[PDB]
């Protein structure tokens, strides 16, 4: 019963890690799909709506045509060197609440491990 259990887990892992592979491929071509402006504003949104005052906003300068709306909303955008996240830095002092995609991908088995599995398996 233990050699059955173990073998299922090893195969089950391969499927979980393989969804992450597919999702990270998406992420490399996420600025290339045209839904990229919609992603960047909602991530930058949550950063300012929270605790920060938005004394500074830090994203890449080639994400700057897609966050120039929010240049004028709060602060100014000067690089994460990611092209896949948005820091925001508060005025309560140092603070800094960073909404990055990498973090959320990575936390997509750290807070919705159930959801994905039920759809995969049942």
């Amino acid at each position: 019963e233990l050699l059955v259990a173990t073998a299922r887990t090893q195969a089950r892992g391969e499927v979980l890690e393989e969804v992450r592979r597919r999702v990270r491929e998406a992420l490399e071509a996420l600025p290339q799909k045209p839904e990229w402006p919609e992603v960047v504003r909602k991530l930058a949104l949550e950063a300012l709506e929270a605790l920060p005052g938005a004394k500074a906003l830090v994203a890449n300068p080639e994400d700057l045509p897609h966050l120039e709306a929010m240049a004028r909303e709060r602060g100014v955008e000067l690089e994460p060197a990611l092209r896949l996240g948005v820091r925001a830095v508060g005025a309560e002092g140092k603070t800094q609440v960073e909404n990055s995609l990498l973090a959320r991908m990575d936390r997509a088995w750290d807070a919705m491990s159930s959801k994905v599995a039920q759809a995969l398996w049942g």
């Binding site: 050699l3 059955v4 173990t6 073998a7 299922r8 090893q10 195969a11 089950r12 391969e14 499927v15 393989e18 969804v19 597919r22 999702v23 998406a26 919609e38 992603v39 909602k42 991530l43 949550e46 909404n99 995609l101 959320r104 991908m105 997509a108 919705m112 959801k115 994905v116 759809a119 995969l120 398996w121 049942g122």
Partner: protein
């Protein structure tokens, strides 16, 4: 008498394991194939909830 009881049991407690190993492996494959053709579906589920 012990001598001929031990070797009886031993020769079944290998075979039994051996047969279970063929099911184990094949049911490993049987959980893979159910997921892998509903795989795109998962990836849509991950994408939709990482963009906030």
């Amino acid at each position: 008498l012990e001598a001929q009881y031990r070797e009886r049991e031993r020769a079944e407690t290998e075979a039994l394991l051996a047969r279970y190993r063929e099911r184990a492996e094949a049911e490993a494959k049987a959980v893979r194939e159910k997921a892998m053709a509903r795989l795109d579906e998962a990836v849509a589920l991950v994408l939709k909830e990482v963009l906030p």
